[PDB]
């Protein structure tokens, strides 16, 4: 409930207050924090003050005015709505020497083709209109840090998946994606799987963590140190998280995992926040195939196709903090549990805690 806390630029910060924008909601602030941190955001939305301003602020912070080309591209379901966005952007940016434009085209498209050639930091328009001035080469794509899809419900669901995707193609890899929409139906939620990565999801209505999409297995190891040996067998390829219920295990397995050519990332709860943030930035970048850590942040979460419990958490409730789509929202995957002859009980009791089958590992990849 404050902008000043959020270390925004003062030229923008005046614009915010000058535009009249009341201190932002807990939720909005979260989105803004995260857009700025440079994460793909899905943000469920609601009729309320900062509806659009909330992301407009975000795009404006992350702008750099010296670079006089298009750095943010914001697509909306209509010319009209895109003009509102434009005007909003201007208003907030009126103390930033900001340059944006709504591709109305909207005869004259000539004035548009003129306006874009002449330098625009941000650019709004309908997924077509934009895709026009990409084909007509009026809009240079080269230095776009972020794509914003306003009212995705109204676009993504309702005939623009093509128009939008066409644009998407002509943009630098991994350009950042923010999907703002009041509604987020299942139809749209896969959509995002196709252009976002390990996205944050800020939804209005709460969402549990089911166990229901996840195939759970356990490797009867069953004395610690046949656990690494089996892990080694196991990975034979993409991204996965490996939990251990102690920092001592984490470090060991890491130094061993890295003896083996297995590019690794490690984490504790006993690390500062900017550290585990620092780490996960990399792990999410792809530059780590194998995140290993303590729970700490478990009750995390990086959307990951394969999770392994090298150790089984004594506290049962952890189990699904370590593992658990989603619940609507998110992705099925595989858990694998490494179980000491000693820890099979604990497995049975986790099994019973969640009222869930945990079958033995049959040697196959689905």
């Amino acid at each position: 409930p404050t902008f000043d806390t959020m270390g925004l630029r003062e030229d923008l910060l005046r614009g915010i207050y000058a535009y009249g924008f009341e201190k932002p909601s807990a939720i909005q602030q979260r989105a803004i924090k995260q857009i700025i941190k440079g994460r793909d955001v899905i943000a469920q939305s609601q009729s309320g003050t900062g509806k659009t301003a909330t992301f407009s602020v975000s795009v404006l912070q992350c702008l750099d005015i010296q670079v006089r080309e298009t750095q943010a591209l914001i697509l909306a379901p209509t010319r009209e709505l895109a003009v509102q966005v434009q005007k909003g952007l201007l208003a907030l940016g009126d103390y930033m020497n900001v340059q944006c434009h709504a591709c109305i085209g909207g005869t004259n498209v000539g004035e548009d083709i003129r306006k874009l050639d002449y330098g625009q930091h941000v650019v709004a328009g309908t997924p077509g209109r934009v895709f026009d001035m990409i084909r007509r080469r009026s809009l240079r794509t080269r230095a776009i840090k972020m794509l914003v899809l306003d009212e995705a419900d109204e676009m993504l669901n309702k005939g623009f998946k093509e128009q939008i995707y066409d644009v998407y193609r002509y943009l630098p890899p991994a350009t950042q994606v923010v999907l703002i929409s009041a509604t987020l139906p299942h139809e749209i939620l896969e959509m995002t799987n196709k252009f976002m990565t390990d996205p944050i999801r800020i939804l209005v209505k709460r969402d549990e963590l089911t166990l229901e999409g996840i195939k759970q297995f356990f490797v009867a190891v069953e004395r610690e140190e046949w656990k690494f040996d089996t892990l080694c067998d196991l990975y034979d390829i993409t991204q996965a998280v490996i939990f251990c219920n102690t920092k001592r295990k984490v470090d060991w397995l890491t130094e061993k995992m890295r003896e083996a050519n297995f590019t690794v990332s490690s984490m504790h709860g006993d690390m500062p926040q900017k550290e585990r943030e620092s780490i996960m930035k990399e792990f999410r970048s792809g530059a780590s195939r194998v995140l290993i850590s303590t729970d700490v942040w478990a009750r995390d979460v990086p959307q990951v196709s394969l999770i392994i419990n090298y150790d089984l958490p004594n506290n049962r409730e952890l189990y699904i903090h370590r593992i658990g789509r989603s619940g609507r929202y998110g992705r099925k995957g595989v858990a694998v549990n490494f179980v000491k002859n000693d820890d099979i009980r604990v497995l049975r009791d986790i099994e019973q805690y969640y009222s869930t089958q945990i079958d033995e590992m049959p040697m196959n990849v689905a």
Partner: peptide, 9 residues
Amino acid sequence: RWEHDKFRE
């Protein structure tokens, strides 16, 4: 899984 082919600076 969308890609950013058909692009080049």
